[PDB]
Symmetry: C2
Subunit: 408 residues, 2 copies
């Protein structure tokens, strides 16, 4: 078929706006978790989150913003940053050969609260005629395609936590299959709202360490008690190798493998033994044509949950056996929390950055490491030149998506 | 790349539960549009819809129905119907080699209404712990996987009206790439609620011919005044040819092409000349390795909208030219309305049935043809064997997805 390489990184995260800011912040071990300021969460049991600080008006026409939900606002910003980072201009690209695939897990959460309120106080005939267009998941992809005139395939995947990776792997296929030569792919999420944090709180899936926001998300530690909700977006420029070299593009790495599986276990609980995750990682290795021992880094899913963090480690030890002990594993979520639908995309960015820069991002807050999970979780940034790395995403529902990256 | 064929059809529609009941209804030109009975619609400007009559308790365990949103229930029923129609028992397959891919355009609409009300009236701490697991779009695929223990890839597409086709096209790629040998793919939608119908009504997307429910959906006619919301699900068994042949599957048709594009034009307004629609159709044919001259039937998106229907006819004339006058075109929506996220899946089932049975389904209500739209819209069921057929889906947001089927 064709090789597919990453040539643009558009990162909008809780610890940095822009791919470079994100990388420097990772190396510093910065935390993007803080008391919630987006709205008054005093009445809630969870009052912390990884909020993004960005001026949309600095990227989009402030006049149009009013008809764009925050999740679409983040996707457009990340896509612009991505194109800029790739050194492209819509005009210098054949619009028919450019696809778009930015997924989301929830979509227009703020719009849902605003309009559902209208619906209740004034009736169904007072709902805004922009409700549907602002809230549905496919509007991130659609808006990006419309803004730049990209007429290549425009799709959207919604698989909760596996969204970002599923979307990237699906774009990988799109280019390998010849349906497009370049694709802006990734994920966006804007669910830091009363109803969403409330919902995840009543589900007991979130950390309640309101007293120490920056220390709440602590994956693989003995005191881990649930994840922290983050927000943001990750849009990467995927490109056929030939198209990249022909324009002299800076290549960050090559996307060589895509593996997926299903736990087929429970609605919100992952398989305690990581049987699904093990299967998805094994499929990513097979798809990329490499052996377990050729991998030197794994950007874990590690959301900081008792059952989940362990299921992953057990799955890693199962797939890498004797090699697991030689692996380096770190969780970006320790710093930016869980970006849900955007998680897989932004983490793919971090994973590509570690290969390109030759430095492995740390898993902060690893103060009380759990002895049952004997893997190297990189408590501090480490200079290392790996050839292959995996990016894991094991979502609610049982959707497992793994990406394999190769150092170019 | 292995050939992929359709070996099972699970249809849950407004005019028939079961692919067979659905086909007989089609040829009888039955209408599934009636006054809304799901809820009291007296305060709405649109009080009709294509409702499905089925008892989930006949397929699923009534105790677990309390925690399943209607869209998930519909997907399970269709999935069960598809496996039975394919002559398959969950244990007659390699669980790891079966994938799941059922999309939806909105997901848990009823759950959103009930829980947004709780949130607003009782507070974010009164929200049900099942809200998130019941409403997120990916739960149709997850639940089907959990029910049968299918551990192959489990993904979900959410691209408005293009959802059904996008999913099937994606499932096709899944099998062609070897990520699975069999996939239960399609779409589901359960959006007949006060908020949804009200939101589409304010957007002026729906017909208001409440006085003659059965005549409201009249695609390509002069007096068309918008679409009629439908509901249900379509789940098909896509299988690698050899896997099917070896087991003695009954093959309805072969899925040979999949084309996609984006209008990159307007949030809800379809490109006036059908530019995106035409590109998608051309792409599906090229993927199929066929030319416009070889197509004999097109299952139109044909929603019964003023701008929409004309745009599609325009795109058909552009891609097929003089052959456009020899082509047979029909809209399943004339009978079952617009199943939104399930539209393309249920219409793919109809297209496959047309090729397998050698009978072309009609477009009812063709009382006042639009002199501008002068193609053969098959007013009466017509016997005819065709070798190739297309099924179109051009959605809000500009997402265009087209499938191409081959007679066996
Ligand atoms: Mg009327």
């Amino acid at each position: 078929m064709r090789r597919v390489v990453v040539t643009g990184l558009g990162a909008l995260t809780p610890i940095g706006v822009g791919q470079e800011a994100f990388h420097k912040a990772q190396l510093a071990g910065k935390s993007g978790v803080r008391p919630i300021t987006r709205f008054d969460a005093s009445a809630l049991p969870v009052r912390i989150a990884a909020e993004v600080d960005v001026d949309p008006g600095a990227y989009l026409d402030r006049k149009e913003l009013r008809r764009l939900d925050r999740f679409v606002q983040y996707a457009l910003i990340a896509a612009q940053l991505a194109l800029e980072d790739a050194g492209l201009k819509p005009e210098d690209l054949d619009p028919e050969r450019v696809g778009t695939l930015v997924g989301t897990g929830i979509g227009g959460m703020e719009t849902w609260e605003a309009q559902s309120r209208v619906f209740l106080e004034r009736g169904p005939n007072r709902i805004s005629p922009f409700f549907i267009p602002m809230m549905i998941a496919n509007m991130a992809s659609a808006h990006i395609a419309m803004r730049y005139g990209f007429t290549g395939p425009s799709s959207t995947v919604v698989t909760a936590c596996a969204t970002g990776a599923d979307a990237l792997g699906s774009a990988l296929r799109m280019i390998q299959l010849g349906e497009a030569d370049l694709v802006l792919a990734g994920g966006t999420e804007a669910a830091i709202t009363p109803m969403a944090i409330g919902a995840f709180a009543v589900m007991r899936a979130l950390s309640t360490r309101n007293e120490e926001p920056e220390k709440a998300s602590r994956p693989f530690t003995l005191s881990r008690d649930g994840f922290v909700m983050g927000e943001g977006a990750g849009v990467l420029v995927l490109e056929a190798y030939e198209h990249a070299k022909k324009r002299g593009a800076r290549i960050y790495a090559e996307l060589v493998g895509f593996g997926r599986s299903a736990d087929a276990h429970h609605i919100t609980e992952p398989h305690p033994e990581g049987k699904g995750a093990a299967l998805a990682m094994a499929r990513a290795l097979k798809d990329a044509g490499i052996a377990p021992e050729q991998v030197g880094y794994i950007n874990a899913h590690g959301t900081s949950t008792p059952v989940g963090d362990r299921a992953e480690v057990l799955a890693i030890k199962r797939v890498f056996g004797d090699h697991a002990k030689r692996l380096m594993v770190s969780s970006t979520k320790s710093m930016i929390g869980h970006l849900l639908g955007a998680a897989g995309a932004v983490e793919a960015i971090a994973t590509v950055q570690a290969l390109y820069h030759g430095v492995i991002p740390p898993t902060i807050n690893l103060e009380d490491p759990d002895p049952e999970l004997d893997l190297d979780f990189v408590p501090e940034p480490r200079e290392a030149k790996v050839d292959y790395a995996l990016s894991n995403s094991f979502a609610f529902g049982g959707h497992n998506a793994v990406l394999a990256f190769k150092r170019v």
